[PDB]
Amino acid sequence: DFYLPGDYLLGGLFSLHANMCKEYEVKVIGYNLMQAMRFAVEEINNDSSLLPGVLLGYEIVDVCYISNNVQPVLYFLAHEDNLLPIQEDYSNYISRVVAVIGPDNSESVMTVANFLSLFLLPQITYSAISDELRDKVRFPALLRTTPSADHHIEAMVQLMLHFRWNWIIVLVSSDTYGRDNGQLLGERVARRDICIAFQETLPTLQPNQNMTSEERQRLVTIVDKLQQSTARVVVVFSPDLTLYHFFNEVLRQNFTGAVWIASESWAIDPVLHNLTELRHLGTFLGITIQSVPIPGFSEFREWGYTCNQECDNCLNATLSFNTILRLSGERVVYSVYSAVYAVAHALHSLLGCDKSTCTKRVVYPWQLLEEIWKVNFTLLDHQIFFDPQGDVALHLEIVQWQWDRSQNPFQSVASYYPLQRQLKNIQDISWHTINNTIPMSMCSKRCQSGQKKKPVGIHVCCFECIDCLPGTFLNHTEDEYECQACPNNEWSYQSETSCF
């Protein structure tokens, strides 16, 4: 499933590996998303209404995560003879691929978008999250079909507001996905009264690596801080293949109580599950985009010219993990599904096929951009349309990690509405506590009446409760951080906010 001809082609920059592209470590999710695009265009062809004739033909080139990000684009927007003429005016250019679709990593997305801004050829990404992609002056041709980092951050922060976690820990990675996301979280929580305890950069390590010395000491220090700090909500921002090592010695350190709000990167990744003793670490939570599975995806999932554009062991690995992928109900596939359908509808209406026939008038990438920046259609009971900043509104979701092998390794706990910017349908979530109670994470218990909540330390979430002296009452009406004296005949005593 790596080539199909058509009157108008399209291209997919899927990430089949990580860590030729076969030399890198096989990644299942790349193959999953590719099969998603596959079903997209296959059904588009079957559905004669969407595009009679003028069939689309995918052209996939494995991007090798962040390694192969430039050559696939060069191959794209080049004539059949692998030759790309250069002109100051690109208006008149016949491009075989009309809109590349689905660079995965944010860095690869940015490289492709920079390479494409010359040609104004649409690029629709299914997983890019970086907030910088919202600025349509540097990336005019970077439509996107999944909510940005801002929305995941708001979802998590509103989750912690609902469960009353005003004292949280956040650990970031050493890449952009870590630093930028942790920054966004910090800036958000600054204005919603959630206070960051301490921030620690999780060292960049590989699953195949055998660790080093200084890095081992650094992670030991990190987990010691984790088990020290009273804050028991740890929000980890990191690619999937980075957590493994850190989680290992987190577990080994007998660090029991916690609530790991997982970033979108590893909120749906099934690699960390095989640790099979993560229950001891505590309730794992994550943020993702949940959608009904494509109705027929089972058929294509289970069915039996460019550099580094083929894989070797992806099919067998995908079928092996199919237990989890089907049970988990892959959902980020609908992002690429909707991207493909957006390109398909823009291309259809541009050719003006009125359910009767298609006029195969010459099309250019920039015309497709002009047409694709405005689409309103219902795809599997979902309205697909881009906001002016080129990001459709798909529902982010919260996933708790159920270890039971039976079914649903990811449980849809909270639904986040992008436009509404709110959190709803918080299904009763299991907890690691002794009575299923909500694990409290506060710097200090709220001060009682008659006690002043004098701030202590940096953050406004920490206070120690002085009982202001006799003749002084806790003027909770006006100020709480200070105790004042009740005037007139009223004369209070220790505590006793109600001054007599």
Add this chain to the structure above:
Amino acid sequence: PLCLSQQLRMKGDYVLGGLFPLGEAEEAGLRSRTRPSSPVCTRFSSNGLLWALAMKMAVEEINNKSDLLPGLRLGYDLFDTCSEPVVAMKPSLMFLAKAGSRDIAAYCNYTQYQPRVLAVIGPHSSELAMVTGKFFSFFLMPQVSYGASMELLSARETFPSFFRTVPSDRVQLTAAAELLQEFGWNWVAALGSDDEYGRQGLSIFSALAAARGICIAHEGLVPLPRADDSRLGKVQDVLHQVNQSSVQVVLLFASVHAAHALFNYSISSRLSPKVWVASEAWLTSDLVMGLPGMAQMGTVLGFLQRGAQLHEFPQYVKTHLALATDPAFCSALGEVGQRCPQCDCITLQNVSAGLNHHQTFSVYAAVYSVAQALHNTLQCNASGCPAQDPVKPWQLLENMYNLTFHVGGLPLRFDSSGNVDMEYDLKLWVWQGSVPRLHDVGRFNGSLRTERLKIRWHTSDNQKPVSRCSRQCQEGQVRRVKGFHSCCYDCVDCEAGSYRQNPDDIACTFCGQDEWSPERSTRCFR
């Protein structure tokens, strides 16, 4: 009118690329893009043209010189960048099209490629550095830059060939961390600009400072001004938290404009004085200097680049301005950006501002680095070279890593990552009244040596502003964790009666009257 478009290129033999900001894009038509193209750059940026003349002087000097590339010439390929990737990338595609042919192939490999140029003198902008580096990584084209400073362009990971000049922010940030370490500062509240420059600087400094034992108190970002409003409120909040963290050093790794906004607001609110370990971006800047009432903001001292002045550059610019005026001269030469008659209609007055700039030498050094890289890869000796076959750029890549080239008598050598090894200097903003002159206090060579006797330190009796975090303090006190990184804590003494049940609690626990327990007492004693 002055005639320079014709002379922005020479045939030579081995052409070298050039991406300089000769003209900077107007902020009018960038947003509107309904036609695939790059917006024209009709405006004139004097510093960019100074840099272009610097590259031309470099190439002319090697061409005239006999020892370097004997019987061989290098050709210019000046192109504009406008500090915008869209209008700075298609030149990059031109640089790999072909020998003469304007079409660029999309082969799977690159070994059979025979590109137009050899090494592309990288863009000044670090964002353009990223874009062009991602482009030339696939083709393995040497790209020695002259403005890039973000540490991300260091390793042979995604930028295998980015042998830049202008040592990265990593070296000056190591220098600043060493400054804080020797000066006893560990409760430092590092700060950076909201743009990517400050972000990368502050990530680097988080790692470095943690390694050095000096742990942050508030890692915050100060927005660049643009239209501030809510960003002005953010600035207010940032300085408020800086003050309320009770520090005396704020390493500000912020661009010039963010620093101007920060200092403007601070003076406008009479914020408390403190030390500002500065970047090279505003250690020498008129913008922050010219704010009235700014002098009472502590002592400002940072690290500056010790780049040997490349003299005779103003002479060369004047000579070219005079020489291009002769109709016969460049008419024969005629027989690239800034090509329109108005674009080339500059004068000595319009360009006589930068002149003795510290980056014309950077461009010189890049050109000479590629010159010596060729000299090594083409096995030329004095007055000869076999020159059997054309050289592909990857051969330079092989022979550009770990290359030492003599420029202006300075034996600059490319480190394994790609950067260059140059020392810095501790410029101190001493105030004689309304003009903070800079002078040497300490020189950084990887081991910062500072003359402690050359800093005024403001305050009274010039005592060094002490900013200390009590790490691992006495057993008679209870520990409260403070800091963006939990490194170190604040010691709090136990109160009467409150016996510290264990030495790892957040407070001291009270006991009954049966036992007598004074302050700083862990166990209630009868």
